[PDB]
Amino acid sequence: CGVPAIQPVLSIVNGEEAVPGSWPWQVSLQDKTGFHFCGGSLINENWVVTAAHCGVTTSDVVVAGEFDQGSSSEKIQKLKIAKVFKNSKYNSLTINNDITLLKLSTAASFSQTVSAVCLPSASDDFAAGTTCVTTGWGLTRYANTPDRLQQASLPLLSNTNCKKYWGTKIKDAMICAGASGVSSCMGDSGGPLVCKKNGAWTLVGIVSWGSSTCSTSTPGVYARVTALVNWVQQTLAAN
Amino acid sequence: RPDFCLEPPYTGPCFARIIRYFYNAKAGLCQTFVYGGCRAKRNNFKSAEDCLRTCGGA
């Protein structure tokens, strides 16, 4: 996990186009018609982790190996969802514990453009200031979504710095990043916020919420995976 | 009809791109809009039919 066959090249609002297939765990969550409503991350061949607020159902589909959503010829994997596991602790009012697991009907066929992201340990400590990356097909301007997958490097923020803006809205299962010239935006939800752990890209956050106008000077708020990974491991083990 | 039917559509703070319906009093019909996935207001429906049954004529 965490090692793309195709290495990404790094120099979402104010982000940049990603090298095709360089973020193999990135999936697009779409309805039966092919409408993209959220992103997600493959954690293995049978499971996808996304946000609870995305409201995924078994009627939706997981699209893996995609780069250009405007390309009808591009080879991809449309994977059916067998069961949706929304964290029962998801707070629809505070948005805390914003995570959901998707168990695929048929496993995804891993390849050069389709593989898994690594999951952190509950005790992992990713320091504030660490340069991480987020990806997705969300709006690049606060408008329709970009056809090609976007990426952006951004720093993790300390809870103290984040609270300087969001105050008490920041809960324990949330981690902030950004306010650095880039911003996750409508359509990026459920997607990954990854940081390197011993050289491997590890899921530190899940795009969740933030500025209502996707302001690049405002902290983006992500579901803190270290605070939710135990729930993830428990769910996989039991299913 | 409820006054919430007269409120403009509310995307919210979450970053999803979910299609929902809202009643547009200026046009007299329910229209689609992009909902962020959380903290929806009441003029937010999963189907045009639900929307028309709740806000039609407001």
Curated annotation (Swiss-Prot), chain A:
Pfam families assigned to the protein according to its UniProt record, in alphabetical order: Trypsin
Source organism phylogeny: Eukaryota, Metazoa, Chordata, Craniata, Vertebrata
Enzyme Commission number(s) from the entry: 3.4.21.1
Gene Ontology cellular component annotations, sorted alphabetically: extracellular region; serine protease inhibitor complex
Residue ranges occupied by any Peptidase S1 domain in the UniProt entry: 12-237
UniProt-recorded name of the protein: Chymotrypsinogen A
Keyword Transferase: no
Top class in the EC scheme: hydrolase
Keywords assigned: Digestion, Disulfide bond, Hydrolase, Protease, Secreted, Serine protease, Zymogen
Primary location recorded for the protein, binned into one broad class: secreted
Localization: Secreted, Extracellular space
PANTHER family: CHYMOTRYPSIN-LIKE PROTEASE CTRL-1, CHYMOTRYPSIN-RELATED
Matches recorded under SMART domains: Tryp_SPc
Superkingdom, taxonomy of origin: Eukaryota
One BP annotation, GO: digestion
Disulfide linkage: 1-118, 38-54, 132-195, 162-176, 185-214
Molecular-function GO term, any one: serpin family protein binding
UniProt xrefs under InterPro entries: Peptidase_S1_PA, Peptidase_S1_PA_chymotrypsin, Peptidase_S1A, Trypsin_dom, TRYPSIN_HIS, TRYPSIN_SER
Active site: 53, 98, 189
Reactions this protein catalyses: Preferential cleavage: Tyr-|-Xaa, Trp-|-Xaa, Phe-|-Xaa, Leu-|-Xaa
Family according to the record: Belongs to the peptidase S1 family.
Keyword Hydrolase assigned: yes
From Swiss-Prot, chain B:
GO biological process, alphabetically ordered: negative regulation of platelet aggregation; negative regulation of serine-type endopeptidase activity; negative regulation of thrombin-activated receptor signaling pathway; trypsinogen activation
Coiled-coil stretches: none
Portion of the full sequence shown: 36 to 93 of 100
Cellular component annotations (GO), alphabetically ordered: extracellular space; serine protease inhibitor complex
Lineage: Eukaryota, Metazoa, Chordata, Craniata, Vertebrata
Site feature: Reactive bond for trypsin: 15-16
One Gene Ontology MF term: molecular function inhibitor activity
Name listed for the protein in its UniProt record: Pancreatic trypsin inhibitor
Cysteines joined through disulfide linkages: 5-55, 14-38, 30-51
Domain BPTI/Kunitz inhibitor intervals: 5-55
Principal cellular location given in the protein's record: secreted
Subcellular location: Secreted
Task performed by this protein: Inhibits trypsin, kallikrein, chymotrypsin, and plasmin.
This protein's UniProt keywords: Disulfide bond, Pharmaceutical, Protease inhibitor, Secreted, Serine protease inhibitor, Signal
